[PDB]
Amino acid sequence: AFSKLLEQAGGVGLFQTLQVLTFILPCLMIPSQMLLENFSAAIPGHRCWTHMLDNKALLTISIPPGPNQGPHQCRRFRQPQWQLWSEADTEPCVDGWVYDRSVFTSTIVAKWDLVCSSQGLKPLSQSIFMSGILVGSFIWGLLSYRFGRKPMLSWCCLQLAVAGTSTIFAPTFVIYCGLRFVAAFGMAGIFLSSLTLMVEWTTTSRRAVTMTVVGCAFSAGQAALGGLAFALRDWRTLQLAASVPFFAISLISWWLPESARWLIIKGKPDQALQELRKVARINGHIEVLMSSVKEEVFCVPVLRWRSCAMLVVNFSLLISYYGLVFDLQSLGRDIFLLQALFGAVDFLGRATTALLLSFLGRRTIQAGSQAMAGLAILANMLVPQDLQTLRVVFAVLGKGCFGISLTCLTIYKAELFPTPVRMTADGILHTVGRLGAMMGPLILMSRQALPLLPPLLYGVISIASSLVVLFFLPE
Template sequence: MADFGEILRAIGDFGLFQKLLLVGLCFPATLLSMHFYTILFTHTGSSYHCNTDWILKISPNLSTEEQLNLTLPRDQAGSFKRCEMFTPVDWDIDSIREHEINQTTHCLDGWVYDTSVYTSSIVSDFDLVCDKGNFVVVAQTTFMASILLGSFIFGPLAESFGRKRAVQISIVLMAVFTVGTALSPNFYAYQAALFFVGVSYGGYRINSIVLATEWIGLAQRTYPSALCQLFSAIGQCLLAGIAYFFRDWRTAQLIIASPLAPVIIYIWLVPESARWLLDRGKTEEAEKVILMVAAVNRRKIPDNILEKVVNNKKGNRGTIRDLFTSPLLRKYLFTVLFSWFSAKFAYYCITLNVGGFGMDIFLTQLIFGLTEIPIQMLGVWLMEVLGRRITAILALTLGGFFSLLILAVPQDNAIAITGFATTGRVSMGLAGTVFNVYVQELFPTSIRQTTNGLGIMATRVSGIVSPIINTLAVYHRAIPILIYSSLCIASGALCFLLPETRSEELPDSTEDLEKNR
């Protein structure tokens, strides 16, 4: 295949076209992070207890405190039981006060929810409490699994039908089903809509980064992944504000969906990757796209460059089989998968525990978002100065170390715990950014999207596992922290097996890769 790096330098490897493309593809990352982090708020349950308004028919002037004392049993700690009530009786109020009610039953008339924090959530709207209390965990796990499925579906889809088409389909699905979540009449409809939101989330994320990377030159190749993470951090900050000012979950969902409208319009203007077109032997289409990019960048293309494009023939293409038959690719693949899994596993474990560090959940979420903005900017500089490998090793090792420090402070020291958790989290986020770049540079064009999809699938598996691991804290708070911290430190050491890819051309075939490495 013609040296695409040479073609890219001739038409401009980071001109106006690449900047517009980069912003256009990375902007939806702001909305993607909202879709993910919104489960922290829409799935949050408020305090609740059985509805015992039956006693008000006997004595309508009872205070709330007296009503609860007369109609709800208490647990051993002295708190009102959430899923039990005293059996209604046909007595007068004086008899109830004098003899009290001893027989209990389950909630007969629904529940009363505390609306001081959230006016509504899926917990209160769909009564996901008591015997349905595990439905919230099911919703979170299903969402994570659907992102995994989206990565699995849209990775090979992009290899067959193009990066552009996969990106467009993902955005349309996301807009439709985000609105669908807000309009869901019951939990099952909500779960179905949330499932397709997750599928589209996984599909867009992997394809947008690859499409942007394949149009950008060597010096700026870290930009797509880092800028996506930067927009994602901004989305986290905006979500904290949306969740704080709009305490109704349906309203919040519609607000999150609204910016997708202009994205649906301009996403159809995004061109296909010329690398993919050339790899597929579609030289005429590739030539048209290259001429368009040169025109936008105001570059005049040398005739010999166009001849290389026109005369390019479809050669031997790599397949997913190469990932397992080539010892070099196999080593890269399993190292990247394990390390990326470890980084995102720790990231999700800390993120999903945002309300468990002792500080206000809205403030903690804002801190999480704000701290990621400078770390992603620093990450671009570190990857260019230190290289991909050293940056990944430092991010994983430091992230694991700071996460372990959470165990070194008392549980009631909310500020210190939040500080260590935030530092560990941003380090894991930086590691994830490095692997987003690494996976583009380690593998050839013909299987780049497939390997990227496998990597993203590994991170989605970590998202599915993390809520389960977090539940082990009921036995001891140190268990989940020790698990994800140890994995990060181990994967940091494993990254010494990877080569440095800074300032190297993207490989177009397995043969090119093995020859150069």
């Protein structure tokens, strides 16, 4: 019924249009913050510092061949081989590394030597961020009953800004990783507050649309990261450009009014009455309020079964999605083009999804799309490095397909669970999905031991979930 009241107080008003415009800004800058370390932490060609090179032929005698048929990136000859050997003439870089600055002027990987034995510290930084999202989204949820959505949006925008601008002045990796947890903690409160405010200040019909617009803004945001990176190579400038813009969003998040629904459930009808009156004034437009909102104010074995399959699918999609989006450099050599293309293939996917759904079903599409994504990830690892266009095409197909599955899952998710239980099951699924997103960047830590372990796991997991969707999900 609250949707109805809002209909009365201009749920069809301009205040919705303006609210969506204002929220498009945080949604355009969030993907840049999360996936920034694909460009700020890019791995540049590195080699041992040798006395013969830093104090073309000199390269060979100083540094041995490598497994990828190139200067080894981890060890050097103790004594120069003017003979040009045994693995015994090799020593790890005791004196450090000499990174190439041709493509990436400055990357964290060069600042804190996140190479060789430490090559896993880069994927961990991306999982400390993701954990910071999970721990944050949990805490902000608890604090949601006590504090308002608007104050939480404004604070969490400042938290992200301070912490994000501050990382540029971080002397050690521990501090960097810590200041990325704080930034992610804040971003979780932005995701929560933004969504909750937009959903709750619109009628139930427009919700599905409003969410589509927010989703499109995120896709444009991913694309824009590639562009912002192409312009700002220095990691410090990229971090400021993806963090500073939040201070402005925090100041322009004051115009927004507090969720009326929250105020009423909280217990404050007078405050709630004021906001609706204001939104209405924007739209050029107490007993009525209560009578309408009074109603609003997996134990079952079948439900237990569906829930498990759903959790397995939501975990798998996001343990493979995040793996792909956090590993741009391993996919194709041009990361800048790839990020932009990834952001673009999301829009195309959204649009294709509808036609595909017309002809087929929410279950076939999901499974088929997931399988296709897994197959694409498997193809990329197999496709030769020389054929770059093919490698890029398969990755973009993988990203698009994950987008088709994540769109289909959402529709299916809400549909399968009753309104009393939608909140519980949806929340549990999201918690599982966030755990998956924190174990996606972590499987990439295993590249050291077995290079093909990351792509093989993302591929096989996706294909396995495809089967689960096909067998244990109805329409």
